[PDB]
Amino acid sequence: AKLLPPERMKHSIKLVDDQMNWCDSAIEYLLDQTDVLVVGVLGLQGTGKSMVMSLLSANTPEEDQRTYVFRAQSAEMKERGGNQTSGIDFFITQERIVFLDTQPILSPSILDHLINNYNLPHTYVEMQSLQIAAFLFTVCHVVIVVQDWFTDLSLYRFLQTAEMVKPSTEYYPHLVFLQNKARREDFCPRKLRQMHLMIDQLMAHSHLRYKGTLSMLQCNVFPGLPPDFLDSEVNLFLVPFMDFSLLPGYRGHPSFQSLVSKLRSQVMSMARPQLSHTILTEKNWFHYAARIWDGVRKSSALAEYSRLL
Amino acid sequence: FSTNFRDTVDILVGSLTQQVSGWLQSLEAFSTTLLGQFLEDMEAYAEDLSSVSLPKLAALLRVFSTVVRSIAYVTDVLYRVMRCVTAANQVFFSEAVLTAANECVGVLLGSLDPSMTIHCDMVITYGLDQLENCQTCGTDYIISVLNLLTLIVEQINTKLPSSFVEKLFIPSSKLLFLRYHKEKEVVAVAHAVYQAVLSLKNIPVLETAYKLILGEMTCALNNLLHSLQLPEACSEIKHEAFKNHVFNVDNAKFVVIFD
Ligand SMILES: Nc1ncnc2c1ncn2[C@@H]1O[C@H](COP(=O)(O)OP(=O)(O)OP(=O)(O)O)[C@@H](O)[C@H]1O
Ligand SMILES: [Mg+2]
Numbered sequence: 337a338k339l340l341p342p343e344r345m346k347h348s349i350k351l352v353d354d355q356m357n358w359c360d361s362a363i364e365y366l367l368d369q370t371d372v373l374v375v376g377v378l379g380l381q382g383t384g385k386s387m388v389m390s391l392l393s394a395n396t397p398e399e400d401q402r403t404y405v406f407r408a409q410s411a412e413m414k415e416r417g418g419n420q421t422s423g424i425d426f427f428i429t430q431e432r433i434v435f436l437d438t439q440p441i442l443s444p445s446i447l448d449h450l451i452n453n454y455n456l457p458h459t460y461v462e463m464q465s466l467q468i469a470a471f472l473f474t475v476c477h478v479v480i481v482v483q484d485w486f487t488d489l490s491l492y493r494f495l496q497t498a499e500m501v502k503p504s505t506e507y508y509p510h511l512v513f514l515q516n517k518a519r520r521e522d523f524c525p526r527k528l529r530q531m532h533l534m535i536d537q538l539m540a541h542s543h544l545r546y547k548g549t550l551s552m553l554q555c556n557v558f559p560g561l562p563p564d565f566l567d568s569e570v571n572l573f574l575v576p577f578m579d580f581s582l583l584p585g586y587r588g589h590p591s592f593q594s595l596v597s598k599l600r601s602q603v604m605s606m607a608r609p610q611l612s613h614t615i616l617t618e619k620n621w622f623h624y625a626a627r628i629w630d631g632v633r634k635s636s637a638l639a640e641y642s643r644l645l
Numbered sequence: 646f647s648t649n650f651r652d653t654v655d656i657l658v659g660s661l662t663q664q665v666s667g668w669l670q671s672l673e674a675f676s677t678t679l680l681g682q683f684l685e686d687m688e689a690y691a692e693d694l695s696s697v698s699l700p701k702l703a704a705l706l707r708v709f710s711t712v713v714r715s716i717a718y719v720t721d722v723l724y725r726v727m728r729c730v731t732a733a734n735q736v737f738f739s740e741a742v743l744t745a746a747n748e749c750v751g752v753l754l755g756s757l758d759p760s761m762t763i764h765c766d767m768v769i770t771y772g773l774d775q776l777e778n779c780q781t782c783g784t785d786y787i788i789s790v791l792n793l794l795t796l797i798v799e800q801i802n803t804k805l806p807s808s809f810v811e812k813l814f815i816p817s818s819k820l821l822f823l824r825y826h827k828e829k830e831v832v833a834v835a836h837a838v839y840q841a842v843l844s845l846k847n848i849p850v851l852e853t854a855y856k857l858i859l860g861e862m863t864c865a866l867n868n869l870l871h872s873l874q875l876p877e878a879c880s881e882i883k884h885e886a887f888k889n890h891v892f893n894v895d896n897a898k899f900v901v902i903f904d
Contacts, residue, residue: 526894581836582902 366618520588706745860884
């Protein structure tokens with residue numbers, strides 16, 4: 337009976353400190369096994385990336401927010417409008433699945449905190465966001481994009497420009513679109529079709545894999561909507577708020593727990609293509625990620641882009 | 646006490662009007678004599694109007710309504726005179742005077758009981774005239790108009806002609822377009838008006854309203870069906886007043902739910 341599991345991480349560990357330094361402390365939790373999956377997310381200040389990762393890795397909606405593996409925002413902290421997660425986080429579930437939680441992009445709180453501390457801090461924050469995005473797009477299998485309100489018109493531009501600053505027949509990780517805090521109007525066939533068409537027209541030359549995967553229609557979310565109603569069902573998912581005389585007792589959308597579970601099941605079965613032309617193990621992947629991070633830090637394209645602005 | 650009411654009336658006819666109004670209403674013949682002078686004054690104001698007399702008229706109507714609410718043969722005469730004087734002064738076009746007059750008429754009509762033959766033609770004409778020009782008005786005037794309409798609907802029972810209800814449920818009616826207001830209070834009072842007009846007892850006068858509502862509903866469903874390239878149905882409850890109309894998908898759905 338010497339086949340005991342390595343360990344069960346009760347909490348996540350910071351992989352990248354606030355000073356943007358590599359932390360070599362997650363190797364003890366890795367093994368010499370192959371076929372591993374990694375997940376990353378890019379979002380705004382209050383989209384809810386930490387909550388999504390907690391609910392999808394080792395947490396349930398019934399559990400209290402204070403026991404989440406990923407530190408989530410608090411009501412007492414939303415008054416000052418500050419960020420909660422800094423750097424990059426690391427955590428591996430019991431199913432040998434690696435999760436990665438990052439800090440918000442273009443967060444005004446980070447800039448404000450940096451003011452009271454090379455040309456202007458704006459370019460510094462911009463390059464930091466570009467570096468994190470490039471690293472994620474380089475060592476990740478699937479990247480989930482969280483959003484609060486649709487029609488941002490700014491996240492797509494950032495994602496498109498982030499693909500041209502990566503370090504290095506190329507590898508393109510899957511991009512999953514998620515709409516957090518969705519309202520009842522968003523769960524309508526007309527709104528769904530409009531959202532699909534807008535995303536298609538906005539990502540015409542994305543050059544990334546964003547179609548034919550994670551079909552919301554195939555998940556029985558819309559029992560009556562036919563598959564031919566949508567011209568091209570892209571990988572979009574919706575998550576509503578946590579659990580009227582004209583329409584009393586009408587919710588207009590399924591339960592939050594059901595959608596969360598469906599998203600977790602769909603993400604857990606994502607494809608795991610080879611990142612490079614060689615089989616990588618957990619330790620090998622960690623070393624490759626560290627080398628990629630070191631190379632992207634002292635790069636040339638990022639410096640040129642920062643100098644141009 | 647008898648001579649002290651003059652000071653309160655003068656003060657109330659000048660934000661703090663609620664305090665004096667409540668005190669006067671809770672404080673407790675001469676009422677008729679006091680109202681006679683006020684009636685003569687308002688009548689003379691409009692007689693000589695044919696333009697700084699608007700505040701005085703508004704204050705007079707407000708104090709009149711306040712003293713009336715502070716509490717049967719001259720009620721009809723007073724109501725008719727007030728309606729005629731208000732309709733005659735169509736040049737000033739003031740909303741405060743209209744609101745005060747509507748509130749006074751509503752309380753006066755609700756004070757009595759449906760056991761007389763008061764003149765309803767004048768009231769109906771005044772209501773239709775004010776409603777036809779109540780689209781671009783303030784929120785306070787809309788609420789007062791809707792409550793007033795509710796008072797006439799409830800008070801005038803078994804006497805409302807089919808023409809009034811027929812004209813009140815057609816596209817030209819300002820209520821149909823008024824139901825699209827973003828405010829919630831207006832929608833609530835509108836629904837109250839619909840339930841009140843739908844809670845009568847006479848079937849000959851209620852059948853026309855029921856048919857009009859069903860026809861509007863059928864038109865909405867037909868528009869929604871045509872919006873997705875599908876032939877319309879429900880031809881047994883159609884109405885002639887909605888032979889052809891253009892309603893948006895969102896508007897049609899909202900109307901169906903409202904009906
Ligand atoms: N579906 C939801 N329903 C209700 N509240 C939510 C939902 N998703 C997130 N929130 C709340 O919004 C906030 C999101 O902050 P959270 O720490 O979870 O992640 P975040 O927005 O990515 O922040 P950060 O990038 O600063 O770590 C929290 O207060 C969380 O409770
Ligand atoms: Mg967070």
